[PDB]
Amino acid sequence: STIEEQAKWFLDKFNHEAEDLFYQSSLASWNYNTNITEENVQNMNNAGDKWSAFLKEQSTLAQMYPLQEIQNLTVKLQLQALQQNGSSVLSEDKSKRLNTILNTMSTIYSTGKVCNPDNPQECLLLEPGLNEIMANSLDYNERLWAWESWRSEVGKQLRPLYEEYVVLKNEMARANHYEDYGDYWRGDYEVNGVDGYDYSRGQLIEDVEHTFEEIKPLYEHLHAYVRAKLMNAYPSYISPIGCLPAHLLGDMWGRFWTNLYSLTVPFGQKPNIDVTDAMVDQAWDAQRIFKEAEKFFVSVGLPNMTQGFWEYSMLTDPGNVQKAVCHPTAWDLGKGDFRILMCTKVTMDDFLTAHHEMGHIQYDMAYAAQPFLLRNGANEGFHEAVGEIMSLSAATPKHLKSIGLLSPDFQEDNETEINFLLKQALTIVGTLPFTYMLEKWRWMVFKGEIPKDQWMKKWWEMKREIVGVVEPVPHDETYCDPASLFHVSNDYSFIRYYTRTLYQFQFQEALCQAAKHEGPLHKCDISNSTEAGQKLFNMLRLGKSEPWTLALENVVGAKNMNVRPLLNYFEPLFTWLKDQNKNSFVGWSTDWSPYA
Amino acid sequence: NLCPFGEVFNATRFASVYAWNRKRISNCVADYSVLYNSASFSTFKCYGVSPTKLNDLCFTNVYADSFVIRGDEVRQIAPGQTGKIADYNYKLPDDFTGCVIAWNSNNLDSKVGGNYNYLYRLFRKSNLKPFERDISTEIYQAGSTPCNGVEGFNCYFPLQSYGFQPTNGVGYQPYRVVVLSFELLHAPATVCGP
Ligand SMILES: *[C@@H]1O[C@H](CO)[C@@H](O)[C@H](O)[C@H]1NC(C)=O
Ligand SMILES: *[C@@H]1O[C@H](CO)[C@@H](O)[C@H](O)[C@H]1NC(C)=O
Ligand SMILES: *[C@@H]1O[C@H](CO)[C@@H](O)[C@H](O)[C@H]1NC(C)=O
Ligand SMILES: *[C@@H]1O[C@H](CO)[C@@H](O)[C@H](O)[C@H]1NC(C)=O
Ligand SMILES: *[C@@H]1O[C@H](CO)[C@@H](O)[C@H](O)[C@H]1NC(C)=O
């Protein structure tokens, strides 16, 4: 009779109906993503259409229950998620056109090939071919060729697509009552109905910038230490005061500097804290990697993977037998169906990535009993953080020693701890200016602040200014270098990787305090701690039933993102870098270019 | 004189749970332990009895109710349970003496693309009393505004399809259920063990 109980019954209907239409859309996308074909594009489009039409009719009905008369916070949150129409606010033609743009971009990204000047019919994809060069090559010209071919031959294809994607996505967002697509994306962090726990979309930008100010000195000094080491790695090619050339950073973009470890290792004669060589000798394969991640989670009291996960996941590249999207993704298809899609290799990079993606699955499994609309991370940063909390413990030398990837007589120095902290920084700290800069560029594009003829001009200015990275080839407005990264051409928010990285240390403090941990945070391994497992799981199982600000406070005792646990984790490395750099330039000038 | 349990347990098609089927069994010998090891049943719970003890009991009739539900819901086929299945579809009494038997039927009842022929009742104005059976199809009035056997705002067709895809998690997979009630009246006990 009352509105709240009418809404309860309406959600009852919706949850049951939604689950099968979502699941059929997930299966169709899975088919496309493991088997790129035009037939599978059209099935993904058909199931996506069916789901969006249903969502439009249902959200129209949900919006008839005034939220002003709803006491149940969980009933209010579910109805809040149905307050906008969504993707269906585009006409049939524009919606068809938008889909075509997204499918061409995603197909181009993981099937596009570049071919050699030297060889007319060798042909390399991004994955594995070009990524292998960008991760292992020590040759300036080989790395430059892969970095430039990718952007010249594939990025140019994406530029006109990306221009119209911006237009249609913004139109969609304005009809959903946002300013633009970027504002829409920042909505993931909005919290409205809860006194003292609210969070406006505008607050996120200020919190990202204010907290990034506190990360700059650590990054400046990591940057300076890397730049000094690269000078001997690439004689003639590195200015002592300039930005780093964009193609010398260890992957196709410099998103992480992890693969610079071999060049920048503080104490190279200590036992190797990178366990790649060790797992290759021990004949590890993808299966043993994912079995080891599974045993880690079971050690803290969380479940095994399901049978269907082991049966239906794609954990290695299927070959040229069929074309996959190799980028590691954790899938929650619905109805108890959980999968990872990943082209795993025998590297420490993929060992840690296996732990992090499985952590996301662990999260998905923990909130599966939540009603359909709250089956989600408390925000995108929470969902991106869980796995990284885990890999923080899975990466510790003590953990690697206990799974047999370090000698059973491996002994920890101040030197091995600095090695570990340096490698950790190359991944975790190196990505933060990368991540903030990429997303601010997109936010500026979305709000209409960069004329089309200055897209790439502003892109490279912001790389130089914020990131201290410089393009090795001048680039036209025929390029679209941001879209050469998976997340830009596959339409994913990116600031999740910024907020996640601050969260993961905030969480790790609280998990390690639950595990009664002895000493500094970077020596902590939550393995075998079911107390730590319990505190983590109790947050995981909430899904989005609580605002992320209250959810965060329940674990860590703070309502907001906070940079201090990250800075404290890296403090011993920060002290070391400052002493290492005392005879080196620190900071960068944006005027130097590799080209002239 | 063996009882025709095969007709029930090995039937090709099973009823939807909202329209559960009942077979009366009489004038025969039932080996309940032979039936116990007749397969691997995921659930085989007897409430006022034990299987090995049933083979020395006699009843005037046995009733075998059969239907399909998902795995998550097999726990509702027990006395004192609540939930959609127990409240609106199939209710066992509190004083139940009988056996609940279930097995995974994913390989028979799920279909690529989905099998949707199995229904359950999602809404009802009150709870079924034990062994009651509701096969009506009037539109459920969830609101003030009186509907009209027409779905609309606050008005829902009361039955829903399960959706069984072989890729579902085991909780979501189809399970076939057989409930046995043992009846003894003041009349010749015509269903006996060996
Ligand atoms: C890939 O898709 C085609 C149709 O798009 C299908 O016939 C084929 O069997 C699929 N390949 C694999 C390996 O599943
Ligand atoms: C309403 O909220 C209470 C707690 O406040 C919760 O137990 C209940 O399940 C909610 N309503 C429904 C239909 O779940
Ligand atoms: C989308 O939802 C809004 C409520 O915000 C509603 O006004 C509108 O009618 C819906 N779309 C359609 C079908 O017009
Ligand atoms: C505890 O974890 C260590 C490695 O961290 C492992 O060697 C050991 O077997 C575990 N012990 C138990 C009881 O799980
Ligand atoms: C069902 O069929 C199998 C195969 O013929 C048979 O062995 C089994 O006894 C049957 N079950 C019942 C309860 O009769």
- The response to whether A159 counts as a known ligand-binding position is no
* CB < 8 Å to A308, chain B: 167-170
Q: Which residue of A has its CA nearest to B158?
A: A13
Question: Which residues of A are designated catalytic?
Answer: 357, 487
Specify the residue for token string 């490279």: A460
B189: left (phi over 0), alpha (psi -120 to 50) or beta: beta
Q: Cα(A73)–Cα(A75) distance, rounded to whole angstroms?
A: 5
Specify the residue for token string 């990306």: A162
* CB < 8 Å to B172, chain A: 335-337
Which domain range does residue A74 map to? 1-89
My answer on whether omega of the bond before A565 falls inside 30° of 0, hence cis, is no
Q: Cα(A507)–Cα(A517) distance, rounded to whole angstroms?
A: 14
A12:B168 CB<8 A:
no
Give yes or no for A119 touching B (CB within 8 A). Answer: no
Instruction: Please give the tally of structural domains in chain A.
Output: 1
CA distances from A220 to A77, A225, A417, B191 (A): 42, 9, 21, 86
A336:B123 CB<8 A:
no
Q: Who contacts A271 (Cβ-Cβ below 8 Å, separation ≥6)?
A: A406, A407, A410, A416
* CA of A11, nearest ligand number: 2
> Of B171, B194, B159, which Cα lies nearest the Cα of B28?
B194
Rounded (10°) CA dihedral A521, A523, A528, A532? 0
Q: What is the DSSP string of A268-323?
A: TTSPPS--HHHHHHTT--HHHHHHHHHHHHHHTTPPPPPHHHHHH-B-S---SSS-
Q: What is the DSSP string of A183-215?
A: HHHHGGG-B-SSTT--B-HHHHHHHHHHHHHHH
* SS3 state at A266: coil
A208 belongs to a structural domain = no
A18 belongs to a structural domain = yes
SS (H, E, C) chain B: CECCHHHHHCCCCCCEHHHCEEEEECCEECCHHHHHCCCCCCEEEECCCCHHHHCCCEECEEEEEEEEEEHHHHHHCCCCCCCHHHHHCCCCCCCCCEEEEEEECHHHHCCCCCECCCEEECCCCCCCCCCCCCCCCCCEECCCCCCCCCCECCEECCEEECCECCCCCHHHCEEEEEEEEEECCCCCCCEECC
* SS3 state at A378: coil
Angle at which helix A348-366 crosses helix A530-540, to 10 degrees, equals 60
A27 belongs to a structural domain = yes
A284 belongs to a structural domain = no
Q: Do residues A448 and A171 make contact, with C-beta atoms less than 8 angstroms apart? A: no
- The response to whether A151 counts as a known ligand-binding position is yes
CA distances from A163 to A87, A345, A450 (A): 18, 35, 12
Q: Do residues B89 and B120 make contact, with C-beta atoms less than 8 angstroms apart? A: yes
Q: Cα(A210)–Cα(A203) distance, rounded to whole angstroms?
A: 10
Sequence-distant contacts of B83-88: CB under 8 A, at least 24 apart:
B84/B120, B84/B121, B84/B122, B85/B17, B85/B120, B87/B124, B87/B127, B87/B128, B88/B18, B88/B120, B88/B121, B88/B122, B88/B123, B88/B124, B88/B127, B88/B128, B88/B134
Type of residue found at A344: T
Helices within A395-472 (DSSP H only): 397-402, 414-428, 431-446, 455-462
Q: Do residues A77 and A374 make contact, with C-beta atoms less than 8 angstroms apart? A: yes
Residue A69 CB neighbours (<10 A): 12
Mutate to test the interface with A, among B154, B167, B170 (most CBs of A within 10 A): B167
Handedness of CA A165, A167, A170, A175 (dihedral sign): negative
Q: Cα(B80)–Cα(B83) distance, rounded to whole angstroms?
A: 10
Q: Which residue of B has its CA nearest to A337?
A: B169
For ligand 2, whether the C-beta of A15 sits within 6 Å is no
- Ligand 5-lining residues (CB < 6 angstroms): B 5-6, 9-10, 35, 38
Per the entry, the structure determination technique was: X-ray
A23:B163 CB<8 A:
yes
> Of A455, A510, A506, A520, which Cα lies nearest the Cα of A483?
A455
* CB < 8 Å to A24, chain B: 113-114
For ligand 1, atom 13: residue with the closest CA = A322
Q: Which of B156, B160, B169 lies at the smallest CB-CB distance from A336?
A: B169
- The response to whether A190 counts as a known ligand-binding position is no
* CA of A62, nearest ligand number: 3
* SS3 state at A524: coil
* CA of A176, nearest ligand number: 3
Query: Do β-strands A244-245 and A469-470 pair in parallel, antiparallel, or remain unpaired?
Result: parallel
* CB < 8 Å to A336, chain B: 168-172
Domains detected in chain B: 5-118+164-192 (3.30.70.1840)
CB-hemisphere CA count at 13 Å for B57? 18
For ligand 1, whether the C-beta of A590 sits within 6 Å is no
Specify the residue for token string 């040759």: A139
* SS3 state at A340: strand
Specify the residue for token string 């091995």: A416
Min CA distance, A397 vs chain B (Å)? 37
Q: Cα(A592)–Cα(A464) distance, rounded to whole angstroms?
A: 10
* CB < 8 Å to B124, chain A: none
Q: Tell me, in angstroms, the distance from the centre of ligand 1 to residue A200's CA.
A: 46
> Of B19, B63, B69, which Cα lies nearest the Cα of B43?
B69
Can you read off the two tokens belonging to residue A193? 């109905």
For ligand 4, whether the C-beta of A396 sits within 6 Å is no
Can you read off the two tokens belonging to residue B152? 């609309």
* SS3 state at A472: coil
> CB pairs below 8 Å between A and B: how many?
54
CA distances from B142 to A12, A249, A342, B89, B151 (A): 11, 61, 46, 19, 11
B169:A308 CB<8 A:
yes
A6:B142 CB<8 A:
yes
Query: Do β-strands B43-46 and B98-104 pair in parallel, antiparallel, or remain unpaired?
Result: antiparallel
Q: Tell me, in angstroms, the distance from the centre of ligand 4 to residue A383's CA.
A: 27
> Of B172, B166, B169, which Cα lies nearest the Cα of B71?
B172
Give yes or no for A60 touching B (CB within 8 A). Answer: no
A9:B144 CB<8 A:
no
- Ligand 3-lining residues (CB < 6 angstroms): A 56, 59-60, 63, 83-85
From the CA of A57, give the closest atom in ligand 3: 13
A337:B167 CB<8 A:
yes
Diameter over CA atoms, chain B: 61
Q: Cα(A274)–Cα(A277) distance, rounded to whole angstroms?
A: 8
Residue A278 CA, distance from chain mean position: 27
Q: Cα(B146)–Cα(B169) distance, rounded to whole angstroms?
A: 39
Q: Do residues A426 and A257 make contact, with C-beta atoms less than 8 angstroms apart? A: yes
A7 belongs to a structural domain = yes
A81 belongs to a structural domain = yes
β-partners of residue B164 are B115
Helices within A150-266 (DSSP H only): 156-175, 181-186, 201-233, 261-264
Q: Cα(B186)–Cα(B189) distance, rounded to whole angstroms?
A: 9
